[PDB]
Design a binder for this molecule. Structure first.
Ligand SMILES: Nc1nc(O)c2cc(CN(C=O)c3ccc(C(=O)N[C@@H](CCC(=O)O)C(=O)O)cc3)ccc2n1
Length: 308
């Protein structure tokens, strides 16, 4: 069928590539402008194929969509919009245009974790299960009827990158391709999202990924892994903003109080720099271990190396 792909990143590129390989006519790719150095992976693959690339800035403003952004979109004659990873909200004029409407990839088990940082919040809340949903776009934020959903176990030490790479990305691509196949064969469903279990959270950025030390250790571990790698959980240490990556919970033994103490303002008590990383304490007397640290405009350093 005729498809407009609206989105970005490696994920949008892989979905584009698979749909093209399945015989679909990609009539247009609508993506972010270069930054301004690198061209987005999706525009690169599209032009390599001879497919109309668009780099619109934003569609909405003053409560409204333009006509110059709408009209260039409508020209390509899409029968379905596919929104693999779309960094912004798209006007209903665009969303409702094609005969089949629009489908969106969302890396959570909707109606849980509506919002743009769903993977982060899945881990921050310490959910045992996670996954993704392909849903039909409506005017609300991640509220549209479900086409399909796929589920996975969240591992205790999963960070954003590991669950994404293990499951959300590769299976998300297959889910998007399957959704289109169900649509093309005329069998795709529209399951209204249940009321029960709905949540929505804010988008995670550097500023609001600051660590709140007054929480039990498990909560701090979840907060850290839930913001690892991006935006990167952080705290003030000795005047510097320091980011924390690679958290695990640390049980036994003592332990080991053989590190060099490291004072962290607001921490329930001083941290310990050990050969295996930075031991941190929650407000419940329990411990977590952080493998890697990072300063502003700096490389990753092992927590074990803080004092050298
Ligand atoms: N009509 C419609 N409906 C949805 O549910 C959409 C979901 C998504 C995917 N998404 C899931 O949370 C999402 C991603 C980003 C945004 C967003 O508002 N992004 C801006 C913030 C505001 C803006 O500039 O638009 C940004 O780049 O940070 C909203 C929703 C994308 C487009 C959608 N369009």
């Amino acid at each position: 069928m005729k498809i407009a792909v609206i989105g970005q990143s490696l994920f949008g590129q892989e979905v584009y590539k698979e749909l093209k390989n399945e015989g679909h006519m990609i009539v247009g790719v609508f993506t972010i402008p270069d930054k301004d150095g690198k061209v987005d992976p999706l525009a690169i693959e599209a032009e390599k194929d001879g497919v109309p690339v668009f780099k619109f800035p934003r569609w909405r403003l003053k409560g409204k969509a333009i006509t110059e952004v709408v009209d260039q979109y409508k020209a390509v004659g899409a029968e379905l919009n596919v929104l693999p990873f779309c960094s912004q909200f798209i006007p209903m004029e665009v969303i409702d245009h094609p005969k089949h409407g629009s489908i969106i990839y969302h890396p959570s088990l909707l109606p849980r974790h509506r919002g743009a940082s769903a993977i982060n919040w899945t881990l921050i809340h310490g959910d045992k299960k996670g996954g993704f949903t392909v849903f039909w776009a409506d005017d609300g934020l991640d509220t549209g009827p479900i086409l399909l959903q796929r589920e996975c176990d969240v591992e205790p030490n999963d960070n954003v990158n590991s669950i994404y790479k293990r499951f959300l990305f590769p299976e998300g691509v297959k889910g998007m391709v399957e959704a289109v196949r169900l649509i093309a064969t005329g069998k795709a469903p529209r399951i209204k999202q249940p009321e029960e279990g709905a949540t929505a959270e804010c988008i995670q950025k550097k500023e609001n990924s600051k660590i709140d030390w007054n929480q039990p250790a498990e909560a701090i571990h979840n907060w850290i892994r839930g913001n690892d790698r991006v935006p990167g959980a952080w705290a003030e240490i000795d005047g510097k903003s320091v980011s924390f990556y690679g958290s695990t919970l640390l049980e036994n033994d003592h332990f080991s109080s053989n590190g060099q103490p490291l004072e962290i303002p607001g921490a329930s008590r001083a941290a310990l720099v050990t050969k295996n990383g930075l031991v941190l304490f929650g407000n419940d007397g329990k411990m977590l271990l952080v493998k890697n640290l990072q300063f502003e405009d700096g490389k990753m350093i092992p927590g074990s190396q803080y004092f050298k």
